[PDB]
Amino acid sequence: GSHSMRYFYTAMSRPGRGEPRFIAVGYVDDTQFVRFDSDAASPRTEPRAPWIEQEGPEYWDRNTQIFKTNTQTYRESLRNLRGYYNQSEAGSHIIQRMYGCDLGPDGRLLRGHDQSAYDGKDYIALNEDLSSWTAADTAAQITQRKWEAARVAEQLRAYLEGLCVEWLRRYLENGKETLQRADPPKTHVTHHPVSDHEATLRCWALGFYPAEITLTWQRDGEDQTQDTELVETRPAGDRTFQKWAAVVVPSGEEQRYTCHVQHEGLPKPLTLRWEP
């Protein structure tokens, strides 16, 4: 039902190793569909999902012009931020930006986003009102004044409420067979003895899309949050994701444990136990 589009920009300086690299990637939910890399042999916007390939030459040239312009603006921004923080010309620094729109199950705009960071710390972000900025410090206040003088927020708001939603809806239609298809997890429980009196119960979830999932262990119906080893959701490399949750249980006490799985692709939530 719910869908989102995001662009992720990374601009990285590398003193003594050439000009700053600019890389932009575009996503619909957990599916990447475009890339641009200023370090590429011939920098151009490239398709990364089959449903975007149908876009005409004018689409590709428009994207490439935008990302070439961003490559140059981010090079100036890196020089500016180095100055705002009184940094030496020696260190490598990174500006990151993530922006886009969220749609509800009705296809209506839920909210817009635009956030920037410097060296992995929040720097400046567009407020949920799409009208004002949240500057993290006195350096970010300079950017804020610059962005206010250029009327960035008004232009970004028009984009987030207009073109962003329009293009997201177009992509969702063109890629409906994948983007609007939720693949449920394939699940199982494995048992691994750790001692004479203890064994690990591992609950697996494989081949699911989108990445959002909840995997929990309960002992006698109560959540085992502190006792659960939960790995980060990981990409299988074929669009799907994987996750596991593990508990160390006393041997003979296995049947008191249940694994609970919640995912959009499932007709109804799952309750699993070790099946010896």
């Binding site: 662009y7 689409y59 961003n70 100036e76 500016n80 931020l81």
Partner: peptide, 9 residues
């Protein structure tokens, strides 16, 4: 489609 205005920070 990305936002088209690039503004120096």
């Amino acid at each position: 489609l990305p936002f088209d205005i690039a503004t120096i920070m």
